[PDB]
Amino acid sequence: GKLSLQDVAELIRARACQRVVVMVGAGISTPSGIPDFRSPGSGLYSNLYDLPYPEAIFELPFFFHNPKPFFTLAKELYPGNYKPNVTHYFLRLLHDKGLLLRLYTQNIDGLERVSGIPASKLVEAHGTFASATCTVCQRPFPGEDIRADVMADRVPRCPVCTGVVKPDIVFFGEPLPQRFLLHVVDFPMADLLLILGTSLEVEPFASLTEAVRSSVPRLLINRDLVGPLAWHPRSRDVAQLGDVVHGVESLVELLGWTEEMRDLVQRETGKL
């Protein structure tokens, strides 16, 4: 009696589901080659000055003491270093087709933006490298203005007060962005929830899977079944388990979007 991946594909294709909310995480970053920095066994914590525990890289107190570890990751992730993958372009096609209500990302690689999805459709829940702020005088800076420093392994200093200029990444204990709270209007309005490439381990993001209406399908495309969905399953849940890219590729096939995907990707490659 359960819904199938194909059932969900047909609802989308028929515009029966046309207000899709999407939640994404690191599983869509790793196909682009992004370091698996959410994994403590990432070769990143082999590079990394002297870091007491992985999470310190996004702790303000540690950052003020020693911002070099964070800036090593910043250099790694800075705009232009990585290209969006087929998962990102799938989401861009969903937008293009008039089906994307909102995409909530826990990622900081900016690949959703780079795929061409407009900012109106994005909730960058953990911030962005596109902009930075001085930690002392609060002066805002475009990310290009600290690029040369970041790429030269220099800690960027404010020209006004010599405070450290910190990319607009959300650190532990900081307010989530204002746009996060769009969830209170978006999730109740969604007619489909897609959960792509997230272990749903980082709270409070993981708990949003419960905020869709009880009748709305929730489709998980992920290597493994994730607790929030599984602990409290609903009758219209669907799980496409396996490599996230192969899962999206299956969905694109069922949707009939293979050619439109090729056209899009071909059109977008020049820009990068």
Partner: peptide, 5 residues
């Protein structure tokens, strides 16, 4: 506003 996590 709610805190990261």
């Amino acid at each position: 506003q709610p805190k990261k996590x």
